[PDB]
Amino acid sequence: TSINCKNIQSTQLTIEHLSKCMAFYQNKTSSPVVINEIISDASVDEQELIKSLNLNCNVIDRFISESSVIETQVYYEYIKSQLCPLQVHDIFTINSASNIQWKALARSFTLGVCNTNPHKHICRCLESMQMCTSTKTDHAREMSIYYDGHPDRFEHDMKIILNIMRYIVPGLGRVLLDQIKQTKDYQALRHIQGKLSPKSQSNLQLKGFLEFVDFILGANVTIEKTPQTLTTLSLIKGAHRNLDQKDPGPTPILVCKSPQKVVCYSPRGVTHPGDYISCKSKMYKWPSLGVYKHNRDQQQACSSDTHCLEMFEPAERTITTKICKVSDMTYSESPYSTGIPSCNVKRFGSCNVRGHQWQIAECSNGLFYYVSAKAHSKTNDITLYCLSANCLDLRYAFRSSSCSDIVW
Numbered sequence: 001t002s003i004n005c006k007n008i009q010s011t012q013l014t015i016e017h018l019s020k021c022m023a024f025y026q027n028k029t030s031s032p033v034v035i036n037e038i039i040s041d042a043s044v045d046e047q048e049l050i051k052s053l054n055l056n057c058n059v060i061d062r063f064i065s066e067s068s069v070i071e072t073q074v075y076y077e078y079i080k081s082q083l084c085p086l087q088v089h090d091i092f093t094i095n096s097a098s099n100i101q102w103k104a105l106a107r108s109f110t111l112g113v114c115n116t117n118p119h120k121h122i123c124r125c126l127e128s129m130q131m132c133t134s135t136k137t138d139h140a141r142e143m144s145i146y147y148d149g150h151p152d153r154f155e156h157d158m159k160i161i162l163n164i165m166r167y168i169v170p171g172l173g174r175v176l177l178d179q180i181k182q183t184k185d186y187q188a189l190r191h192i193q194g195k196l197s198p199k200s201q202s203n204l205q206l207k208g209f210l211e212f213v214d215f216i217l218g219a220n221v222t223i224e225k226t227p228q229t230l231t232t233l234s235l236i237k238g239a240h241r242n243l244d245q246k247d248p249g250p251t252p253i254l255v256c257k258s259p260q261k262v263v264c265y266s267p268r269g270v271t272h273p274g275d276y277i278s279c280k281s282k283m284y285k286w287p288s289l290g291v292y293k294h295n296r297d298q299q300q301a302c303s304s305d306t307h308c309l310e311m312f313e314p315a316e317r318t319i320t321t322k323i324c325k326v327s328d329m330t331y332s333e334s335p336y337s338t339g340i341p342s343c344n345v346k347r348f349g350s351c352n353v354r355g356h357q358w359q360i361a362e363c364s365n366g367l368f369y370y371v372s373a374k375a376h377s378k379t380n381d382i383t384l385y386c387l388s389a390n391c392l393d394l395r396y397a398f399r400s401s402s403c404s405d406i407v408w
């Protein structure tokens, strides 16, 4: 059957049916549509809700991962299918740019089945992108011996495979993959890979990988599944913590004092709940780059990173008309949330933040850090620098966008 990803029903909130709403499954490979045209079918309030987000092809996956309600995530995934066809389908072109990530992971995270007999064609496919044409047919009996009746190993390799596929289907596909990982419902992966394979026939490497995913999904093993507990519009409607005061902040702010998570949905018509943050009981838009703990005061919330350099945008004016449930605060677990005392420095530079110069370093991970005036390298590595004076205190990355006039 077919479903409407713009207005997904309660019965259709399963991995089997949610997989039909992955952007690539829309079979739209060209002609991007402007955002104002994509959203003209929906309600006026939903239209203001989306226009307020300033969606583009660079931020829509972050809005998808950052959203809390599954209907909203599906909706933004459809918007991505309409807004970024080339980006959505670039992975299926052989050796394309979008292929760099999954292959990379495939070389770094060796499967457990590749510990012995590394000349198997699946191992050479993930390691050197060779023999990808015979991944399932080569040594299928030995790999069956390795997998059948061995749930431990099977789960190891399945986790590796899911992590690999998180870079093949970004957005909704990643949500479904993490859901599979949490529920251990490994057979449900057939609803994803089963839709990827007929579109990967030209990408011979991806084709071989997906064929092996099929093979391992056929393993004679038994694992009991964990309940799904996926957040739906129904969970939001049937919940407490109602807010009578839904007033938006007058002006944008940097520091969110007394933060609370908020999820707001319109009372009538088809709606997709929007995410907001309350700061001193004033409504602000939840940023696509995540909410972080202020490094200067960890009971305060910042947008995009821990330095409170990015402005919180006040909520739309119609927020008072919508219903709002307070939700538990969720902070970002991205690398910008965790501080480090030292790093291997690629280069030192100077950057103009808030109108003043600051010595910065780009570490090997690509992140930018303020560099202590007492920074120094460690004994056995000329690139390994203490970012703090005592080489113990943690220092947090900041987005390069808060810089201007970077000088290397």
Ligand SMILES: *[C@@H]1O[C@H](CO)[C@@H](O)[C@H](O)[C@H]1NC(C)=O
Residues within 6 Å of the ligand: 025, 026, 027, 198
């Ligand atoms: C896209 O093509 C697949 C076949 O590969 C089909 O199952 C699906 O329904 C199509 N999506 C549409 C028509 O929206």
Ligand SMILES: *[C@@H]1O[C@H](CO)[C@@H](O)[C@H](O)[C@H]1NC(C)=O
Residues within 6 Å of the ligand: 148, 149, 220
């Ligand atoms: C799977 O393995 C078991 C042994 O654990 C075996 O008895 C059975 O025949 C195999 N095939 C199945 C269950 O289809």
Ligand SMILES: [Cl-]
Residues within 6 Å of the ligand: 027, 028, 029, 030, 031
């Ligand atoms: Cl087309």
Ligand SMILES: [Cl-]
Residues within 6 Å of the ligand: 065, 174
């Ligand atoms: Cl993510």
Ligand SMILES: [Cl-]
Residues within 6 Å of the ligand: 370, 394, 395, 396
């Ligand atoms: Cl810092």
Ligand SMILES: [Cl-]
Residues within 6 Å of the ligand: 398, 399, 400, 401
């Ligand atoms: Cl950045």
